[PDB]
Amino acid sequence: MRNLDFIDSFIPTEGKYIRVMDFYNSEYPFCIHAPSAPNGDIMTEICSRENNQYFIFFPTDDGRVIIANRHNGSVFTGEATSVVSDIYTGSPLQFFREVKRTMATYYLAIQNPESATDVRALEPHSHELPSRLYYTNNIENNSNILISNKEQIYLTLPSLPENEQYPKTPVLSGIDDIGPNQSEKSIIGSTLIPCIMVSDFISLGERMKTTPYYYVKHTQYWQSMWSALFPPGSKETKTEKSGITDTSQISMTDGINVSIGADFGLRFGNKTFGIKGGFTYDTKTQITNTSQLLIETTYTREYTNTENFPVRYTGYVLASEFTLHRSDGTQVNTIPWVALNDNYTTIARYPHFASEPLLGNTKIITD
């Protein structure tokens, strides 16, 4: 359609809107309120329209949610006997499960060093007065843990780019054509990432209001490594770079809490570990199966022209790049996050009917 095209949107998923919460059984208009300070006790306070009372539920791979307030971006953190507001560190006590008992009412549960065991729900000790949120094992047929949404404001998400087809190998126009330094960049995939998991100069509280979601864009392209006119039957030695620089790995890790493994799979830190499955699916990448990090390696390779005529040859290496963007589209990272993979190479040639160069011996330079 046009309208019906957004039929999926009419009934939104948990992390597409800002909400105001209240316990169903309270008769007086109490709302769940977060402290102005970055750390403090979560409380039921008289409902007002302040950002202390507005929350976004950020969903994770397994369906659990991270609950951040719109005033400062601090999240719900489970503690000994009470729920407090604190800075998101990816701690296990910062993941909650929303359970819908009915279409309109739900309760929030936290789980222990246990699995199927002690699921306890959040409950106030009063309906008449402002209260802290405590735990209870009394779940079944208990309406005191029951929460309702007073308000629901729909979020406008950034427009994500359309997925492109794998990058094609560059063509050469003549014997003197070295070819382009890079091929056209191809959008392989892009994914949405909560503002609380990214590094930026904008304050958390401000990100919550204007850019609650950031997005990571994944692109591929062919990078030029070398180019030469090979005389008939000549052997030449060309140098080919591979992997990721030390600065780029540090910048990426700092910026999105994601690193690249030696197998070219991705390594997720404590902040992003819970969303790794959604991240890799959207970007068409894989999770790493090794603990070694990808480093930078310089290789030498012998190439022999077997044709009886001179040939132009340009060597390209497959480049994979990640960019961090704000809701307004602006790019956050100033340092490039690029990994070159020397296992995937393509050799552009003139004339086109000429054979592939014969690959001889490969060495590694210890600069």
Added chain:
Amino acid sequence: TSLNYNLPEISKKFYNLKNKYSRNGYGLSKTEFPSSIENCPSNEYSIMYDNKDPRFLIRFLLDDGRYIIADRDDGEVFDEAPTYLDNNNHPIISRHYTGEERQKFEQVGSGDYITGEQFFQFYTQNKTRVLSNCRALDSRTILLSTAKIFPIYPPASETQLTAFVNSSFYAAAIPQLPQTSLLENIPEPTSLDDSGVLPKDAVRAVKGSALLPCIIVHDPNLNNSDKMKFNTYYLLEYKEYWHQLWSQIIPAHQTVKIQERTGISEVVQNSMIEDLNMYIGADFGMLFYFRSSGFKEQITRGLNRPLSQTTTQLGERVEEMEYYNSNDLDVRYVKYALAREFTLKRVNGEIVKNWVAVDYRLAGIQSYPNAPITNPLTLTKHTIIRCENSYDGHIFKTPLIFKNGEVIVKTNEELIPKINQ
């Protein structure tokens, strides 16, 4: 918009697994001959190690990154038996898929990636046990898991018995993913006698699709060997269409009672459980049982249908609605609700089964004569006649106007009792 389910390479190929250090080409084998090593007894279930009769194994990816290892020829999986051998070791045995912890393995890559000389190991029980050949590198023996783990940087002699590389392979059978399409507008009747479009003739829109590993699928038509070789992954399609609830001529200025049956019946739910260990929750999200649970997240991500947030099962919904025709003429009215359709197909395209859930939350009406000739129909009374659960006991606040071709979203309308308070 095309689609990619994003399976890793090793989840798309049945590989022959050879030891990295063996000089005479020994690897994982289905050899009929028993173990030649004294302290390494073999039997009918033992996974063998030999340089003849190689096994071709696939690695199905679990949501937590662990793998299920299955054999191409007989469709059985690798299993860590609880029985003890010498030195507190467990034998690795062939068994039918159950989805238990003992069938899950963690792959860990190490070595010199820079020179392409890397290898991999299989671990169990939170990396406390490593899979190893029993005593030998170049002799027919068995496979077991040991709790005697050694350093990998200087590769101890014992570590060599745990190191694997990929060799030859067979392609798994992967069905092609269909392309998504848009949902059509609610179909208009062409005349007073036009009864509308029935579900059998309704135009479908593809919205999702997932690749289900054959081990979780119950397809009685095929034996486990044919199933694994020719139908390694089944295709599960997710579609939407406008499912007609009723079609009737309403006389001028008349109120009429109409029953609206939506949701899903128990028999259909039981069927989905039987075949896929999957079923629909009252919030229309997906629920899973033990045998398919390990793949929930990958499946739902592919389908574009969320994981359910309730434990309540969707059931049959029967509601009685009263409508009022305000026009001076007799009018053909027809009401459609959104159908959520799931289809299981084999690699060749053969349909195994269909399951439909009717979503009463998204529905609309169309008429003959159309607008602007006729005035829209009005809902004057809403009663819930029969429903086995109280997940959604809300009715519409009446009167409610149903504008031709407009979709009415139950959650965006005023209800009784009021929600979102």
